[PDB]
């Protein structure tokens, strides 16, 4: 209990397509973060952190849910 950083080091404040997303991850304020952070698996291989502060994020993410649900 000394110093803990949020899961998302930074957020990718740049629009891109939902086509690349296969897995979604949402972590609510934890013992390391006093807020909320959206995370996503990047089909390139890595992971990526999105900022719910952007409208395009609420959209590409919304489509993922509507797509994984309709599937």
């Amino acid at each position: 209990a000394k110093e803990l950083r949020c899961q998302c080091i930074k957020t990718y404040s740049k629009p891109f397509h939902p086509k690349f997303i296969k897995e979604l991850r949402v972590i609510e304020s934890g013992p390391h973060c006093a807020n909320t952070e959206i995370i996503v698996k990047l089909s390139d291989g890595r992971e990526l952190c999105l900022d719910p502060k952007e409208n395009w994020v609420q959209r590409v993410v919304e489509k993922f849910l509507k797509r994984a649900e309709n599937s």
């Binding site: 998302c8 080091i9 930074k10 990718y12 690349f20 991850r25 291989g45 992971e47 952190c49």
Partner: peptide, 16 residues
């Protein structure tokens, strides 16, 4: 890298 389309990050410090 080829996963993209002419596009995800061209930078990477987003590793939770």
């Amino acid at each position: 890298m080829w996963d993209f389309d002419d596009m995800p990050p061209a930078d990477e410090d987003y590793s939770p």
